[PDB]
Subunit: 104 residues, 2 copies
């Protein structure tokens, strides 16, 4: 099958009900790789952190895996749409598309 | 499995003998999507077109698929390495990592 990129685990499509919370994540094998999350081509979600959105990055020493999380909270209908996770290392770039659907 | 991105067909890992030729390609469902090919993070292969490297983009009307090709010719040992295909549409971005190994 397909070449192995940077994503040990890609972000997945998700569904949430209005007012609900949902987490998206990515894992990258092990400087730390650096993540960016986007809605659409150009909206950098780091600029949107607040009551509805939070980011958290961590590292598991045993497995040598880096975890990147995107937390959506109190979901609103406008959050529905197309998202992208981008990761960079000293030597590579990769990215991964996924979708969020907000119901109700 | 994983969310559907822009790649109907991702570029694959390839192997070639020195002096050999090899083609890498990507397919994207249907302005045309626009491709960039890289070696490493930053070398834009459009700037390297010549006796060893050529690019060709086309469209199949029946299937509505766009094809992006990277042709490597008279392969040299230094061409071995990590490559990336990036594609953009009006609404999305995606990319795909792959490797070339030159033997002998």
């Amino acid at each position: 099958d397909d070449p192995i990129g940077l994503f040990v685990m890609r972000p997945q499509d998700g569904e949430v009900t209005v007012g609900g919370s949902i987490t998206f994540s990515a894992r990258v094998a092990g400087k730390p790789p650096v993540v960016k999350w986007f809605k659409g081509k150009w909206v950098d979600l780091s600029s949107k952190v607040g009551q509805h959105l939070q980011l958290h990055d961590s590292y598991d020493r045993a497995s040598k895996v880096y975890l990147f999380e995107l937390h959506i909270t109190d979901a609103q209908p406008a959050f529905t749409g197309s998202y992208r996770c981008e990761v960079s290392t000293k030597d590579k770039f990769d990215c991964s598309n996924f979708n969020l659907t907000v119901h109700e």
